[PDB]
């Protein structure tokens, strides 16, 4: 829906000759909710409506509003012209309400989304140098489409709900397969079997699809040389380009999520078909044990990227952001000077926010490393959008060791979205567990839940030596042989003191004394800190007990 | 002879009717003043409070009644919606009440002409406590003497129901977790539910009975505090199902327990309303004795200010406020 479709839908519901006000999105959301609520109140004639009749009236009025938005969206979506850029190959669709951009599909999305009549006309040489492998991939994708055409809206919702609720997507793919077999009126399982018999090596074709859908990065993102920054820093820096790139990710993650769902259902079908149908009894069972968990992890990774590409950023006041950046600068989590970004007061997704803040600064480097050492190559839209989108997918990848996506959300005060991101990530991703618990602890501290923050900080302390993000918090005290865990606890103790939570400072300092076993100076400093906070709270007995435990007579 | 030097209230505000419950808005309303609700015999009053401790332009307490809602029945509990905002171009006031008629009422207002309420029916016993889901604001949890915990949408449709083994006495959402619910039962059992799985995750048992009130610490999601019999009880999760601390709160039973919204080591308790005065005790975990002891005539409700170490209790036709040092 265009904002223009929504504004027109409201005007007609109001039956009112009101001028089009250029409403903000928050005003528009308030105005939509109030307009639909007023129609619900007008539809409720009686004071004694049952909760179910009220629910039904609510659904009906939202459905009427939605249908009104659809009719206006259809009218605004009418194509008026095509703009083809001769030098850049950029293709633009000029609609009545809006402008769309055409980006080239990747190989996997192209083969999945092409009409069945044209799939037989694809040049096998574009798919693989190996004609037999190309034919196996085409036959496999026809099987995935046969599955996709029979998945009901309820079955599609059941998989999406399973990912949201952190259920095993493998077990849910097995349930959907049971329901598909129970409802097999058209002998489709026989058609899928007949087409799978045409596949010489289904395992190699599955492995090829999973590999082209995998954006796991080996950690060699070399740090930027400073001297080429000034002319390329503004490439794709417009809000229009940001949203086009983030929409490319939203669409790629949505299409690949469907491919991973249908592939998981097909892999469970291949397991059920067993030794009776495919020449390879012992190799199929053993290779599917490795490929099913990989397809499940890709499904969850694309669900996360899709969710983030649709999740709206919260509007944060500049004063709260500047204060959070001062608090994070005390943590040294911020090298970036606040360039006076007027937050252009547009709605952005958390992926649009990440793109503008972090990913954008790295694009000049991606452009240079790829052989464009000649400043004379003409800009090609088709190659550039594909490269930008692949790079941004690597940065958004849940297994990425750089952890920059969660760092960007914390920096922009996006605590609710960061909590939901960490909730959706922790059960199945083991790469950045400590960094997730540290970010979650900071979110709980801002929420005023200091006890849960302390538990999460204590969990994060276990992974401090393994994760590059937690190691960055340690590297700045050039002082003698302190354990990295004790340096981390000293950092968390400074942060709990700045927030003014003395009880949690004592609990953490007591834990930190256990880790300080060999350093009597750190033990003296921590026990002096415990003494000060017990004294400030008026716990005279505990302050005296802490004083007797101080190993340094001068501090005592 | 230790004369229990009962501290006078730091501030006192007169009310038009008897105060049976009082609750500060725990959410950001975007106004400079803290929103407060109090429930009387047939009315709910919404007010703004500004204190000299947060605003140097105020001498003492500035108390302003914003709106009075006719309720018709005695109000027992109040819950704020996290969608409540007063600084918006379209202000939204939303809160829920539980009353002596066993019904929930959701009030929605723009502070102008649009004043609507929805009645939710289904509890067969008295409702003892109710809360909005904090972060989404879409769902209400309620507990009562019908041995049920119920979950409602804003449309008054029951989404979920948990059968309890005794009367439900208090309910709290997990501060960071949209699907985690704490339910405290009169027999001393505190249960945690997951609303995605519809399962009990864990339980705690009080060393005394009856359990009368429990609260989830917002500043430390591992801490649970309650009052049972004469004592206050604290647990630290997941370390133990046994209480970390159990100490005397009140001689003639403890009634209410609430954590401070600004300090994880500070909480308040109220004694059972005797014939003349209820005791209020503010505790800090580092101290073996209450840091402040107050008294109110027939103490009713207990709530904490969002930012200040300031608590409120209703009593007769008055609100009484106690500030503690941090």
């Amino acid at each position: 829906f265009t904002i223009a479709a929504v504004q027109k839908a409201i005007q007609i519901l109001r039956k009112g000759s009101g001028r089009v006000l250029d409403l903000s999105w928050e005003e528009l959301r308030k105005d939509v909710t109030l307009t639909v609520e007023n129609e619900i109140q007008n539809a409720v004639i009686d004071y004694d409506v049952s909760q179910e009749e009220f629910r039904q009236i609510n659904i009906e009025n939202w459905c009427k509003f939605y249908t009104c938005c659809l009719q206006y969206q259809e009218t605004l979506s009418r194509p008026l012209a095509l703009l083809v850029h001769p030098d850049t190959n950029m293709v633009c669709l000029l609609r009545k309400g809006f402008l769309s951009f055409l980006a080239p599909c990747s190989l996997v999305e192209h083969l999945y989304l092409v009409p069945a009549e044209h799939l037989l006309t694809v040049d096998e040489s574009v798919i693989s140098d190996d004609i037999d492998a190309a034919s196996d991939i085409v036959n496999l994708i026809q099987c995935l489409r046969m599955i996709a055409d029979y998945i009901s809206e309820d079955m599609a919702y059941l998989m999406e709900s399973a990912c949201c609720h952190l259920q095993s997507p493998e077990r849910v793919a097995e349930q959907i397969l049971e329901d598909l077999i129970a409802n097999d009126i058209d002998n489709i399982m026989e058609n899928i079997q007949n087409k799978l018999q045409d596949t010489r090596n289904p395992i190699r074709a599955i492995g090829f699809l999973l590999q082209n859908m995998d954006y796991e990065t080996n950690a060699d993102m070399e740090q930027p040389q400073p001297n080429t920054r000034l002319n390329l820093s503004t490439l794709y820096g417009s809000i229009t380009a940001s949203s086009v790139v983030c929409q490319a990710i939203c669409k790629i993650s949505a299409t690949r999520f469907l491919i991973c769902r249908d592939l998981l259902i097909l892999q469970h079908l291949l397991l059920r078909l067993g030794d009776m149908a495919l020449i390879g009894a012992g190799q199929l069972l053993h290779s599917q044990q490795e490929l099913i968990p990989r397809a499940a992890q890709l499904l969850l990774s694309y669900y996360m990227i899709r969710w983030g590409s649709q999740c709206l950023a919260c509007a944060v006041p500049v004063d709260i952001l500047e204060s959070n950046l001062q608090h994070l600068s005390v943590l040294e989590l911020s090298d970036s000077q606040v360039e006076k970004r007027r937050y252009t007061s547009g709605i952005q997704t958390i992926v649009e926010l990440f793109f503008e803040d972090v990913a954008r600064k790295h694009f000049p480097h991606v452009f240079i490393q790829s052989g464009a050492s000649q400043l004379q190559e003409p800009l090609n839209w088709s190659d550039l959008i594909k490269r930008i989108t692949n790079y941004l997918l690597q940065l958004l990848w849940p297994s990425n060791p750089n952890f920059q996506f969660a760092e960007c959300l914390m920096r922009n005060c996006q605590y609710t979205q960061l909590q939901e991101y960490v909730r959706l990530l922790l059960p199945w991703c083991q790469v950045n567990v400590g960094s997730c618990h540290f970010m979650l602890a900071q979110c709980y501290l801002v929420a005023g839940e200091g006890h849960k923050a302390l538990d999460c900080f204590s969990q994060a302390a276990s992974e401090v030596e393994r994760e590059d993000f937690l190691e960055k918090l340690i590297r700045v005290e050039e002082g003698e042989s302190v354990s990295p865990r004790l340096q981390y606890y000293n950092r968390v103790l400074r942060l709990l003191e700045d927030v003014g939570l003395p009880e949690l400072v004592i609990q953490l300092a007591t834990i930190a004394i256990g880790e300080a076993s060999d350093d009597w100076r750190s033990q003296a400093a921590l026990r002096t800190r415990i003494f000060k906070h017990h004294l400030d709270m008026g716990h005279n007995n505990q302050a005296y007990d802490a004083l007797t435990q101080i190993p340094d007579p001068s501090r005592q | 002879m230790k004369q229990d030097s009962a501290s006078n209230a730091t501030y006192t505000v007169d009310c038009e009717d008897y105060v049976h419950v009082v609750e500060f808005n725990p959410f950001d309303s975007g106004e400079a003043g803290s929103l407060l609700a109090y429930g009387g015999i047939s009315y709910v009053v919404i007010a703004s409070c500004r204190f000299q401790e947060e605003d140097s332009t105020v001498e003492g307490i500035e108390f302003k009644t914003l709106k009075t809602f006719h309720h018709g029945e005695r109000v027992v509990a109040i819950a704020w919606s996290p969608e409540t905002r007063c600084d918006a171009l379209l202000p939204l006031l939303r809160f829920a009440t539980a009353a002596g008629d066993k019904k929930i009422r959701i009030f929605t207002s723009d502070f102008q002409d649009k004043n609507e309420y929805k009645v939710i029916e289904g509890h067969s016993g008295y409702i003892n406590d109710l809360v909005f889901c904090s972060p989404e604001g879409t769902d209400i949890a309620s507990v009562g003497d019908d041995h049920t915990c119920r979950i409602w949408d804003l449309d008054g449709k029951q989404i979920a129901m948990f059968i309890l083994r005794s009367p439900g006495m208090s309910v709290a959402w997990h501060p960071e977790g949209a699907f985690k619910l704490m339910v405290a039962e009169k027999t001393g059992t505190i249960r945690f539910y997951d609303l995605t799985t519809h399962q009990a995750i864990l339980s705690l048992e009080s060393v005394q009975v009856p359990l009368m009130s429990a609260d989830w610490c917002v500043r430390n999601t591992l801490r649970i505090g309650a009052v049972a019999g004469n004592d206050w009880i604290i647990w630290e999760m997941p370390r133990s199902s046994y209480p970390q601390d159990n100490k005397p709160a009140h001689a003639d039973r403890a009634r209410m327990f609430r954590w401070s919204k600004c300090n994880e080591n500070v909480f308040a308790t109220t004694g059972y309303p005797g014939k003349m005065k209820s005791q209020i005790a503010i505790h800090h975990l580092a101290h073996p004795q209450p840091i402040l002891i107050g008294t109110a005539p027939v103490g009713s409700g207990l709530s904490w200010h969002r930012r200040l170490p300031l608590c409120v209790v209703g009593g007769y036709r008055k609100l009484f406020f106690w500030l503690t040092e941090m």
Side-chain angles (χ1 to χ4, degrees):
Chain A
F1 294 120
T2 63
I3 292 173
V6 178
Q7 285 178 344
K8 282 184 178 178
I10 296 167
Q11 283 171 13
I12 290 171
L13 279 157
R14 287 184 177 176
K15 295 179 181 167
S17 180
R19 288 183 178 180
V20 194
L21 291 166
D22 289 331
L23 297 176
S24 72
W25 179 246
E26 294 185 1
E27 285 157 23
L28 187 71
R29 183 180 179 177
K30 286 172 184 171
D31 266 29
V32 170
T33 46
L34 289 170
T35 304
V36 178
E37 282 176 3
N38 287 332
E39 286 294 316
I40 292 163
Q41 286 179 10
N42 289 333
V44 174
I45 303 172
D46 296 323
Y47 280 96
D48 288 332
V49 182
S50 67
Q51 289 183 358
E52 192 59 27
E53 287 164 330
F54 184 81
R55 185 183 184 154
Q56 184 59 25
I57 291 166
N58 193 8
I59 292 167
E60 285 178 19
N61 285 316
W62 281 108
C63 288
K64 286 169 192 164
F65 176 65
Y66 176 77
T67 306
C68 191
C69 292
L70 284 177
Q71 291 176 354
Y72 285 112
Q73 187 59 22
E74 179 176 19
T75 303
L76 289 175
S77 76
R78 184 181 177 183
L80 296 183
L82 188 75
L83 173 66
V84 180
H85 192 317
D87 312 314
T88 63
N89 304 308
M90 184 190 63
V91 185
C92 279
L93 186 66
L94 297 170
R95 296 176 175 258
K96 177 169 177 157
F98 60 99
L99 169 67
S100 319
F101 296 79
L102 302 187
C105 292
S106 131
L107 178 64
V108 176
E109 303 85 344
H110 172 63
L111 293 172
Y112 188 74
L113 297 172
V114 161
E117 300 180 355
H118 294 88
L119 188 66
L120 299 175
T121 66
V122 181
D123 198 325
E124 290 179 338
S125 66
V126 179
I127 306 177
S128 195
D129 294 326
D130 185 357
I131 297 173
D132 292 327
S135 75
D136 284 345
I137 293 158
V138 173
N139 286 328
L140 182 65
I141 291 173
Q142 289 174 8
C143 300
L144 297 178
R145 289 175 63 164
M146 287 187 288
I147 291 168
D149 292 337
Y150 288 104
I151 287 169
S152 66
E153 294 184 1
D154 291 328
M155 289 161 182
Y157 176 75
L158 184 145
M159 184 64 77
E160 192 165 324
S161 182
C163 292
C164 192
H165 298 106
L166 303 156
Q167 299 182 356
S168 155
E170 308 93 342
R171 291 180 184 176
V172 168
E174 184 171 25
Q175 287 171 5
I176 293 167
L177 179 64
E178 283 179 1
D179 292 336
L180 285 172
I181 292 166
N183 297 315
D184 189 22
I185 298 171
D186 297 316
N187 289 0
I188 301 140
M189 298 299 123
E190 193 182 0
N191 292 325
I192 294 166
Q193 282 169 36
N194 288 331
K195 204 71 191 131
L196 284 171
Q197 287 175 12
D198 295 334
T199 66
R200 301 188 189 169
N201 193 340
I203 304 160
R204 185 179 177 196
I206 293 168
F208 179 89
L209 290 183
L210 295 176
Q211 184 181 8
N212 282 279
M213 293 190 297
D214 201 344
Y215 292 106
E216 192 165 34
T217 312
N218 295 328
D220 294 329
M221 293 301 311
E222 288 186 335
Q223 287 186 355
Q225 290 212 2
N227 287 348
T228 30
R229 286 189 180 180
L230 291 170
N231 285 358
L232 302 179
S233 55
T234 39
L235 286 176
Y236 285 68
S238 90
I239 297 160
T240 303
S242 178
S243 199
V244 174
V245 174
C246 296
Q247 286 298 326
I249 291 198
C250 182
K251 295 291 186 174
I252 286 163
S253 58
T255 306
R256 291 184 185 200
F257 172 85
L258 297 174
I259 296 172
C260 294
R261 173 197 72 182
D262 301 336
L263 184 64
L264 279 166
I265 294 165
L266 185 63
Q267 286 174 308
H268 288 83
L269 179 63
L270 288 171
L271 286 179
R272 285 189 180 207
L273 291 174
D275 291 333
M276 282 290 191
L278 282 146
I279 302 172
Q283 289 182 350
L284 283 160
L285 285 165
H286 194 51
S287 57
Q288 290 290 0
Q289 284 175 346
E290 297 183 344
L291 295 172
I292 290 168
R294 189 175 184 185
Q297 186 179 347
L298 292 186
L299 183 79
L300 291 172
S301 301
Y302 284 118
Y303 178 76
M304 284 299 279
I305 294 167
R306 178 182 165 202
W307 170 86
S309 76
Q310 294 179 347
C311 192
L312 302 184
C314 285
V316 180
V318 182
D319 306 323
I320 298 180
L321 181 75
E322 284 184 6
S323 51
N324 184 37
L325 289 176
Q326 288 170 15
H327 288 291
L328 291 174
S329 77
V330 174
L331 296 178
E332 297 177 337
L333 286 167
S334 65
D335 275 339
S336 62
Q337 293 193 339
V338 185
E339 285 183 346
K340 292 175 178 175
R341 287 182 184 174
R342 293 180 190 169
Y343 283 89
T344 42
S345 358
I347 313 152
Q348 58 184 329
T349 69
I350 61 174
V351 174
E352 287 171 327
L353 178 67
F354 175 67
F355 180 83
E356 290 184 10
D357 192 37
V358 183
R360 187 178 61 166
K361 295 172 180 153
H362 298 281
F363 293 135
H365 186 254
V366 181
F367 198 87
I368 294 165
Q369 280 188 323
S370 303
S373 44
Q374 302 183 13
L375 289 160
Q376 289 186 349
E377 285 188 347
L379 290 166
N380 188 7
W381 169 253
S382 294
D383 293 324
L384 188 54
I385 192 58
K386 183 181 176 186
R387 287 175 190 199
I388 290 170
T389 307
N390 282 346
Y391 182 75
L392 183 63
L393 282 165
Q394 287 173 340
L395 291 185
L396 291 173
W397 201 250
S399 303
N400 189 320
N402 291 324
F403 200 63
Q404 287 176 342
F405 181 66
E407 189 189 333
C408 184
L409 297 183
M410 183 63 207
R411 187 175 142 228
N412 291 295
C413 313
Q414 303 300 315
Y415 306 114
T416 39
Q417 291 78 0
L418 182 55
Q419 283 178 351
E420 185 63 2
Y421 176 76
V422 171
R423 185 193 72 77
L424 290 170
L425 185 61
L426 278 173
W428 58 268
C429 185
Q430 300 299 318
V431 183
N432 297 312
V433 180
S435 300
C436 286
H437 287 97
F438 178 81
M439 289 302 185
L440 185 62
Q442 292 187 351
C443 297
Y444 287 138
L445 191 67
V446 177
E449 297 193 338
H451 291 291
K452 299 189 199 158
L454 183 67
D455 291 334
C456 291
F457 285 132
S458 305
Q459 289 169 2
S462 65
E463 300 299 329
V464 171
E465 294 178 356
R466 287 166 173 183
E467 298 182 6
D468 292 327
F469 172 84
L470 295 179
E471 204 195 352
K472 287 169 189 172
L473 297 170
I474 303 168
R475 281 184 178 179
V476 186
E477 291 190 358
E478 288 189 332
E480 296 175 326
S481 68
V482 178
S483 64
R485 291 188 177 170
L486 180 61
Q487 299 190 19
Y488 172 84
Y489 286 129
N490 282 325
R491 195 58 153 174
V492 180
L493 284 167
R494 288 177 185 157
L495 171 142
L496 291 177
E497 284 184 338
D498 291 337
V499 180
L501 296 175
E503 294 187 354
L504 301 175
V505 176
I506 289 158
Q507 290 177 7
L508 190 62
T510 304
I511 296 166
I513 286 165
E515 298 284 324
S517 62
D518 298 345
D519 183 18
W520 75 271
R521 293 181 173 164
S522 291
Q523 289 183 13
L526 290 175
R527 288 185 179 131
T528 295
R529 196 178 232 171
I530 291 172
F531 163 79
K532 185 184 174 191
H533 288 295
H534 278 299
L535 184 62
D536 289 340
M537 294 187 308
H539 296 177
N540 298 337
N541 293 335
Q542 295 177 336
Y544 178 81
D545 292 335
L547 179 73
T548 64
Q549 297 176 16
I550 298 177
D552 180 1
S554 68
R555 288 173 184 239
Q556 184 178 60
Chain B
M1 277 174 156
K2 269 182 173 183
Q3 239 165 347
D4 287 329
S5 55
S7 185
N8 290 333
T10 311
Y11 309 109
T12 300
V13 173
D14 290 320
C15 304
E16 298 183 343
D17 196 16
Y18 289 90
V19 186
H20 286 308
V21 57
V22 58
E23 286 295 355
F24 275 113
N25 181 17
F27 308 112
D28 224 306
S29 45
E31 277 187 4
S34 282
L35 293 178
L36 186 82
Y38 73 84
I41 296 175
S42 305
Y43 306 93
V44 181
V45 179
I46 306 304
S48 188
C49 304
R50 293 167 67 208
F51 303 89
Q52 68 181 17
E53 289 70 28
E54 61 183 4
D55 196 321
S56 60
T57 69
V58 178
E59 190 179 356
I61 188 178
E62 187 187 357
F63 184 92
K64 184 183 177 186
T65 299
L66 301 182
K67 198 73 168 196
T68 301
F69 296 87
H70 188 69
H71 185 282
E73 285 296 337
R74 177 178 172 200
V75 189
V76 181
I78 299 177
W80 289 98
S81 180
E83 295 186 4
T84 294
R85 295 187 180 181
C86 292
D87 70 330
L89 289 173
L90 295 176
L92 176 62
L93 170 62
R94 189 186 298 145
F95 64 93
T97 65
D101 70 342
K102 315 170 182 184
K103 304 186 188 188
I104 302 170
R105 295 176 181 64
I106 305 176
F107 291 85
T108 299
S109 178
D110 65 354
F111 298 95
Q112 302 297 335
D113 297 320
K114 196 183 182 210
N115 301 280
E116 58 189 334
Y117 72 90
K118 197 170 205 174
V119 185
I120 306 180
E121 301 188 353
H123 274 293
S124 60
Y126 290 106
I127 300 162
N128 292 318
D129 198 11
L130 80 175
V131 289
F132 276 85
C133 183
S134 165
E136 300 301 315
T138 61
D139 297 2
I140 300 168
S142 62
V143 293
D145 286 349
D146 66 1
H147 309 178
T148 69
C149 182
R150 295 180 183 219
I151 314 296
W152 317 92
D153 59 25
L154 306 185
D155 277 314
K157 184 188 175 187
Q158 193 183 280
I159 303 161
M161 178 182 74
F162 305 100
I163 303 175
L164 310 181
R165 295 188 179 185
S166 79
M169 295 303 309
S170 191
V171 57
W173 291 95
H174 184 284
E176 307 175 337
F179 306 111
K180 288 179 185 175
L181 190 75
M182 184 189 78
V183 177
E185 299 188 70
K186 191 173 184 171
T187 51
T189 309
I190 306 177
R191 297 181 183 241
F192 301 92
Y193 294 94
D194 188 319
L195 283 142
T196 299
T197 66
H198 297 281
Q199 290 179 1
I201 302 159
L202 186 54
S203 62
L204 308 171
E205 302 298 342
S206 65
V207 291
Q208 294 203 30
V209 296
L211 182 158
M212 291 302 306
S213 170
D215 196 23
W216 204 329
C217 187
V218 176
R219 295 296 299 154
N220 185 341
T221 57
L222 302 184
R223 288 182 180 172
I224 308 297
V227 282
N230 286 2
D231 292 8
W232 60 254
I233 308 171
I234 305 303
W235 299 256
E236 188 181 331
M237 304 308 289
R239 299 188 190 226
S240 184
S241 55
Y242 300 97
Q244 177 180 2
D245 284 289
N246 178 43
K247 306 191 188 179
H250 299 288
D252 295 328
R253 307 176 177 175
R255 181 179 176 202
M256 228 62 74
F257 182 103
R258 292 294 201 190
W259 285 108
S260 172
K261 305 311 181 191
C262 70
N263 187 333
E264 67 175 313
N265 299 312
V266 177
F267 60 94
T269 65
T270 65
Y272 198 87
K275 286 184 179 180
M276 293 188 182
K277 295 187 179 188
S278 303
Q279 189 185 38
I280 300 154
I282 306 180
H283 299 86
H284 182 283
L285 291 175
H287 297 307
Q289 295 297 300
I291 57 173
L292 184 151
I293 300 178
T295 66
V298 194
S300 293
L302 172 65
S303 199
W304 283 95
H305 190 278
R306 178 179 161 95
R307 299 181 185 155
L308 300 175
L310 183 146
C311 75
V312 65
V313 174
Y316 198 73
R317 299 191 174 200
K318 301 189 181 248
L319 297 169
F320 301 90
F321 304 86
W322 292 268
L323 186 70
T324 185
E325 297 178 0
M326 286 192 280

